[PDB]
Each structure stands twice: as C-alpha cells, then as structure tokens.
Write an enzyme that holds these catalytic residues in place. Structure first.
Site, PDB file in Angstrom:
ATOM      1  CB  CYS A  36      -0.814  -0.087   1.291  1.00 44.42           C
ATOM      2  SG  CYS A  36      -1.860   1.380   1.448  1.00 44.42           S
ATOM      3  N   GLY A  37       0.369   2.350  -0.490  1.00 44.11           N
ATOM      4  CA  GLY A  37       1.179   3.601  -0.516  1.00 44.11           C
ATOM      5  C   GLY A  37       0.548   4.637   0.415  1.00 44.11           C
ATOM      6  CG  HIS A  38      -2.916   7.242   0.331  1.00 48.71           C
ATOM      7  ND1 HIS A  38      -2.292   7.684  -0.825  1.00 48.71           N
ATOM      8  CD2 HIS A  38      -3.579   8.332   0.837  1.00 48.71           C
ATOM      9  CE1 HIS A  38      -2.587   8.988  -0.973  1.00 48.71           C
ATOM     10  NE2 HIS A  38      -3.370   9.433   0.012  1.00 48.71           N
ATOM     11  CB  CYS A  39      -0.981   1.853   4.298  1.00 43.13           C
ATOM     12  SG  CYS A  39      -2.455   1.353   3.375  1.00 43.13           S
TER      13      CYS A  39
END
EC number: 5.3.4.1
Length: 120
Positions: A36-39
């Site tokens: 994930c990148g927005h986590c």
C-alpha cells in the site's frame, strides 16, 4: 509468546483480534499492506496519538494489521481496500465504528478525545 508492538501502537492477528477487542475497551485497528502507498502517510502520526496517553495513563490503544500477513480477519469483514481503519469498543463484533479522519496524529486523538476528553 507475547504481544509485539510498533513504535507506540500494537499489532493484531487472527488470535489477538478476538482478544484485543474483548481485552481493551478502547482499541483502534487498521488493515493495510506492505505494498500500500497511502497506509504510511501517517505512520509516525498514528503512533504519536498512542504516546499522548503515556504521559497521562489512559486505557486507549491503537493497532494495525498486515492484510497480506494475516488476511484472515480482513476477508471476513469484507474490507474495501486499504488503508482501512476500524475502532472496537470492548469487543463489539457486530457494528464497530469507522475513522472518518486520516491526516496526522491530531486526527487520531481528536476522534479519541470525543470518548475521553479532559472534562476537568
């Protein structure tokens, strides 16, 4: 062996979930993945809201899960993509609440204050 933690928050699993929920009244938990990148936009922000109590001694605690590691409680709840934050109250398993924030530690304490607050 023992419940491991991360910075200031803890982690959940297929065995700690049913426990951490019915073990601690206020318990936050989010489902994310290593890809994930927005986590991680608040990795240090979601952990700072857990240290604000260390100076006081409240019983509020937050947590996180690796949908790619466990993936046993996320498929059952039917998550809708990451990051997915959830708040449990002394073990609810029926109608938990959802975090409508996601910007910094303040957004984490702001939602937590609605249940504790100073009220001095």
């Amino acid at each position: 062996d023992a419940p491991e933690e991360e910075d200031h928050v803890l982690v959940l699993r297929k065995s700690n979930f049913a426990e951490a929920l019915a073990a601690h009244k206020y318990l936050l938990v989010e489902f994310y993945a290593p890809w994930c990148g927005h986590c991680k936009a608040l990795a240090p922000e979601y952990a700072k809201a857990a240290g604000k109590l260390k100076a006081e001694g409240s019983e509020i605690r937050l947590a996180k899960v690796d949908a790619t590691e466990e993936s046993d409680l996320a498929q059952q709840y039917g998550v809708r993509g990451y990051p997915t934050i959830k708040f449990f109250r002394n073990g609810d398993t029926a109608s938990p609440k959802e975090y409508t924030a996601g910007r910094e530690a303040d957004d984490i304490v702001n939602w937590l204050k609605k249940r504790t607050g100073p009220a001095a």
